[PDB]
Amino acid sequence: IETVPVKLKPGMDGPKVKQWPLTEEKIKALVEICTEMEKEGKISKIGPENPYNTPVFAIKSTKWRKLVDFRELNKRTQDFWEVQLGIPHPAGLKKKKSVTVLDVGDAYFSVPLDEDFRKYTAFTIPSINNETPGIRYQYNVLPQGWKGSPAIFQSSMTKILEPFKKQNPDIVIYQYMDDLYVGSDLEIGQHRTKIEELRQHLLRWGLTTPDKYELHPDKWTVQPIVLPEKDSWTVNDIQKLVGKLNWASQIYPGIKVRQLSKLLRGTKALTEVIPLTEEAELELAENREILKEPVHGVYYDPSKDLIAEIQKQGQGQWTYQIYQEPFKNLKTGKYARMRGAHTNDVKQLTEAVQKITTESIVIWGKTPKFKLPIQKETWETWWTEYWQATWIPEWEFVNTPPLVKLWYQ
Amino acid sequence: SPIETVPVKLKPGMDGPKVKQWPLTEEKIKALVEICTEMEKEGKISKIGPENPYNTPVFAIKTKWRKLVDFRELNKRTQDFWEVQLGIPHPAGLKKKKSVTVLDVGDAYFSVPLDEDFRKYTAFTIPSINNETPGIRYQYNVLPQGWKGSPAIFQSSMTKILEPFAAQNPDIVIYQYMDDLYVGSDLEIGQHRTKIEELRQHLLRWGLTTPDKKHQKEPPFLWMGYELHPDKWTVQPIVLPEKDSWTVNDIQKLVGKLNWASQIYPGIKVRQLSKLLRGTKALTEVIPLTEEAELELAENREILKEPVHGVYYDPSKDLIAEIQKQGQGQWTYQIYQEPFKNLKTGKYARMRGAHTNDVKQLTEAVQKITTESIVIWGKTPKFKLPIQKETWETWWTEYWQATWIPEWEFVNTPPLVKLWYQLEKEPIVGAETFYVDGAANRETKLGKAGYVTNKGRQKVVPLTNTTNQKTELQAIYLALQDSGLEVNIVTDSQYALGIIQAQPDKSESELVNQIIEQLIKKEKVYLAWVPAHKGIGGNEQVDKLV
Ligand SMILES: N#Cc1ccc2c(Oc3ccccc3OCCn3ccc(=O)[nH]c3=O)cc(F)cc2c1
Numbered sequence: 005i006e007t008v009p010v011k012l013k014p015g016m017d018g019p020k021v022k023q024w025p026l027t028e029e030k031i032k033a034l035v036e037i038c039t040e041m042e043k044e045g046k047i048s049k050i051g052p053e054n055p056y057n058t059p060v061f062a063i064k065s066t067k068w069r070k071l072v073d074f075r076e077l078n079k080r081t082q083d084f085w086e087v088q089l090g091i092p093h094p095a096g097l098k099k100k101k102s103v104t105v106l107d108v109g110d111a112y113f114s115v116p117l118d119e120d121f122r123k124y125t126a127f128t129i130p131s132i133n134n135e136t137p138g139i140r141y142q143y144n145v146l147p148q149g150w151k152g153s154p155a156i157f158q159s160s161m162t163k164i165l166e167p168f169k170k171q172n173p174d175i176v177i178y179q180y181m182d183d184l185y186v187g188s189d190l191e192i193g194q195h196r197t198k199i200e201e202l203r204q205h206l207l208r209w210g211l212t213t214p215d216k217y218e219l220h221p222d223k224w225t226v227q228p229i230v231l232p233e234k235d236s237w238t239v240n241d242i243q244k245l246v247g248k249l250n251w252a253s254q255i256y257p258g259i260k261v262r263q264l265s266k267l268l269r270g271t272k273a274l275t276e277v278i279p280l281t282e283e284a285e286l287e288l289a290e291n292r293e294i295l296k297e298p299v300h301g302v303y304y305d306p307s308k309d310l311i312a313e314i315q316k317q318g319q320g321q322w323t324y325q326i327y328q329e330p331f332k333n334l335k336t337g338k339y340a341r342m343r344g345a346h347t348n349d350v351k352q353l354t355e356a357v358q359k360i361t362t363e364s365i366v367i368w369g370k371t372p373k374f375k376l377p378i379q380k381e382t383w384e385t386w387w388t389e390y391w392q393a394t395w396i397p398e399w400e401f402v403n404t405p406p407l408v409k410l411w412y413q
Numbered sequence: 414s415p416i417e418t419v420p421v422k423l424k425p426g427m428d429g430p431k432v433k434q435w436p437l438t439e440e441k442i443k444a445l446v447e448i449c450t451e452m453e454k455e456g457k458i459s460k461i462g463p464e465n466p467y468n469t470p471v472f473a474i475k476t477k478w479r480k481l482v483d484f485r486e487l488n489k490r491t492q493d494f495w496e497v498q499l500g501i502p503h504p505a506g507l508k509k510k511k512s513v514t515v516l517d518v519g520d521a522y523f524s525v526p527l528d529e530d531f532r533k534y535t536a537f538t539i540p541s542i543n544n545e546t547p548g549i550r551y552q553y554n555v556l557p558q559g560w561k562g563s564p565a566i567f568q569s570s571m572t573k574i575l576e577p578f579a580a581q582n583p584d585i586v587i588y589q590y591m592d593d594l595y596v597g598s599d600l601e602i603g604q605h606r607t608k609i610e611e612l613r614q615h616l617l618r619w620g621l622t623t624p625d626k627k628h629q630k631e632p633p634f635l636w637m638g639y640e641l642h643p644d645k646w647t648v649q650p651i652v653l654p655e656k657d658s659w660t661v662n663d664i665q666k667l668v669g670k671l672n673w674a675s676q677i678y679p680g681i682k683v684r685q686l687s688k689l690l691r692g693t694k695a696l697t698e699v700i701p702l703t704e705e706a707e708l709e710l711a712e713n714r715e716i717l718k719e720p721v722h723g724v725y726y727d728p729s730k731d732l733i734a735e736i737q738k739q740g741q742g743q744w745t746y747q748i749y750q751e752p753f754k755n756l757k758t759g760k761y762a763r764m765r766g767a768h769t770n771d772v773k774q775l776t777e778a779v780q781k782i783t784t785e786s787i788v789i790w791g792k793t794p795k796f797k798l799p800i801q802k803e804t805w806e807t808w809w810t811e812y813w814q815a816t817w818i819p820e821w822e823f824v825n826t827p828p829l830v831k832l833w834y835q836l837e838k839e840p841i842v843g844a845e846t847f848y849v850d851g852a853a854n855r856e857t858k859l860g861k862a863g864y865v866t867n868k869g870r871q872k873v874v875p876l877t878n879t880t881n882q883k884t885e886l887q888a889i890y891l892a893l894q895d896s897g898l899e900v901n902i903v904t905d906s907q908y909a910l911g912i913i914q915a916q917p918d919k920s921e922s923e924l925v926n927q928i929i930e931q932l933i934k935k936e937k938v939y940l941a942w943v944p945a946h947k948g949i950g951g952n953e954q955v956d957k958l959v
């Protein structure tokens with residue numbers, strides 16, 4: 005129980021983010037949670053001479069967990085705690101036939117946090133209507149959601165995990181903050197029995213885990229674009245097809261389209277049918293054959309953090325692309341799930357963001373900055389209502405994505 | 414005096430203020446030594462023998478001179494603190510109490526001791542006898558006025574002095590605010606007066622004077638621009654000046670007063686009055702008021718002639734909020750719990766989106782009100798809105814953004830929020846197909862707009878003082894004018910397709926308004942797009958024409 009010293013990157017002050025207004029119910033859950041944590045020693049009240057603040061939220065399955073937004077403290081510490089105490093990211097985790105996630109954040113709560121550092125973990129429980137300045141805490145142990153907590157604990161973690169790895173060399177185990185990804189090529193029943201084996205092994209060494217949720221990164225990554233396959237095509241369908249191929253041509257080098265363009269030689273009515281030429285099928289079938297291949301020369305770049313764009317499609321579907329440079333996608337996909345009595349645009353969007361962030365963690369070990377299609381203040385109000393991860397991606401709110409909505413589905 | 418001090422650092426690397434004293438006039442020096450011997454006898458300051466390198470200047474000003482101590486160079490150097498309570502309670506969020514009193518804490522900052530190790534950094538000096546003799550050297554033992562740390566250290570010191578009293582009196586409500594305590598209770602009068610004297614004695618035991626019941630402020634309370642009444646609240650009376658001429662300064666002050674009043678007086682409008690400020694920010698630039706602006710101002714005076722009041726919150730009752738449209742993208746709303754009284758009122762405006770839509774603006778207003786409800790009461794209102802279920806459902810299903818729509822019910826008070834037209838999702842069989850294009854010269858600023866149809870019609874129209882995007886909107890306006898009630902249109906412009914596929918009800922550009930009229934009139938309009946300069950057919954001929 006000798007604290008690891010923690011130093012900030014040079015010339016860098018502590019975080020000073022504003023704390024969001026919260027409803028009375030969520031303030032009461034935060035007050036109960038913190039009243040308990042204070043008498044367990046995990047946190048303590050602080051005075052006016054501590055200026056830093058970090059946002060706090062309450063989320064839910066039928067009881068309230070607290071959720072701290074350490075994004076700003078993470079930018080000002082962990083970026084010098086990746087160069088110093090960084091966690092290597094395996095490239096095999098993206099390939100395993102199954103991957104289960106295990107929450108192991110409880111392990112941080114025994115370990116003391118460095119005495120000189122605690123000031124920077126300060127947070128505020130708001131009062132309603134500014135009746136009081138908020139209740140004002142700082143952490144005395146490693147906080148969940150801080151990216152220094154896993155880095156400090158990783159020696160203890162690799163020690164506790166080592167005998168299980170020696171027993172099962174072919175399992176992959178990677179740690180991103182509070183979560184442990186474990187991947188195997190086992191049959192799903194063998195995979196889940198091995199997961200329960202790891203849960204029992206973690207319990208014998210004093211690590212509780214909540215459960216009493218699997219990924220399949222054999223994902224068919226970055227799906228090819230599909231042209232419509234109608235039995236008979238009107239001027240309108242050919243115009244939409246030619247425009248879609250023309251947008252593709254700035255991504256795929258070899259698209260040809262001239263014998264589809266001459267196919268609308270006259271100033272035709274939009275609904276007039278046109279037969280396809282023996283020459284025009286040379287455009288359609290060959291553009292399909294060239295559209296069914298991966299783009300050449302697209303590689304992940306460690307020096308540049310990933311970007312993820314989303315487009316609502318209607319009917320509960322959402323298209324997304326993870327990319328680092330424009331028109332050079334590293335992954336694309338489609339989220340889709342709905343229940344009419346239990347689904348709306350923000351629930352679908354938050355679930356999609358969590359799913360994309362999980363894919364991004366399994367694939368590259370870091371998270372994308374989202375370009376979310378939603379009013380800013382709407383999202384800032386309601387995103388916590390369906391949030392479930394302990395981590396939070398960066399995000400911003402983007403103006404209209406026009407007409408590409410058809411071009412990505 | 415016995416209060417525990419808050420430890421205080423200097424900023425890292427930085428060291429304490431060493432500042433040469435300015436010369437002081439003869440009448441002021443003795444007037445300062447006079448205040449200083451009394452401050453010392455009270456223990457607020459203490460003399461020092463100059464082993465202390467630091468100094469800051471001391472001014473005087475005035476039947477009783479006061480002393481001033483510039484502290485910028487020290488405040489530059491001391492550590493940051495917890496930010497001192499930005500914002501204030503909203504009276505709509507207070508709950509009624511049978512008794513309310515207001516205690517001014519006197520000498521507030523000088524009653525709370527300064528941290529010991531830091532006191533040496535507050536040294537100051539009084540010149541003596543035209544700098545012919547060394548002056549006195551005092552230093553503070555308590556929070557200086559104007560010190561960067563005084564307000565937040567006093568706040569937390571006060572909150573700690575109140576702890577035993579709140580512990581012993583769970584039912585009494587105390588609000589802190591700077592020098593003031595606001596105490597409310599549901600005790601019968603006399604029991605409340607006894608508790609006020611108890612709290613006053615407890616405060617004096619910690620060295621904090623408070624007004625005697627002969628000097629405690631009487632209701633209604635004039636606080637932060639409100640009149641706080643025992644059973645109602647309102648804003649302090651608004652005065653709108655009548656001027657023969659108006660500067661940007663005057664329009665700023667007027668827009669501010671009108672916005673302030675809008676929290677309780679319903680229906681105040683600010684659009685035209687604030688459009689005057691859209692130009693250059695030179696504060697003295699006199700601007701003529703416009704016709705619509707003075708109409709708006711008179712319509713505001715009409716509402717301000719009659720006084721209006723708000724009620725306080727009752728947690729047992731439901732929280733209802735209702736929204737009404739006004740002209741040019743203005744919306745007003747009332748938050749209320751009872752049929753004839755409001756908790757508060759307010760407005761919303763589209764705030765410089767180039768083209769907007771009634772359902773989008775109504776949704777943004779519901780968003781603004783949801784954020785206000787969470788801030789002021791910690792919950793969100795039930796909504797009563799002038800829109801039908803099918804209208805909003807259709808809009809939020811077509812719309813490209815995600816959107817949260819809370820529980821709400823229809824209120825059939827016109828004007829109603831409606832969808833004024835809908836583009837067809839698929840091309841119109843049997844309807845004429847216009848291919849349109851428009852082009853312009855960026856230097857000469859003249860252009861052409863035209864169309865070519867499958868029926869064989871063609872037309873071209875000259876344009877002066879236009880831009881290459883404005884011409885492509887003009888070409889669509891042309892096709893709408895020259896077609897029957899069902900028309901297909903094929904444009905080569907991404908910009909025009911974005912402006913029109915958003916389905917706006919309104920725009921600050923007159924040409925888009927003229928298009929919106931034609932879209933409401935036409936029975937069906939399919940709008941399609943193709944890349945320019947690709948020889949598509951139709952678009953090729955139209956591009957050749959222009
Ligand atoms: N000067 C002054 C000032 C005075 C009082 C303030 C204030 O009283 C309260 C303190 C504790 C609980 C409720 C309170 O107010 C409820 C509304 N209210 C007001 C006056 C009255 O006569 N009756 C009544 O119901 C609260 C506050 F937020 C600021 C106050 C400021």
Ligand SMILES: [Mg+2]
Pocket residue numbers: 850851885905906945
């Ligand atoms: Mg054009």
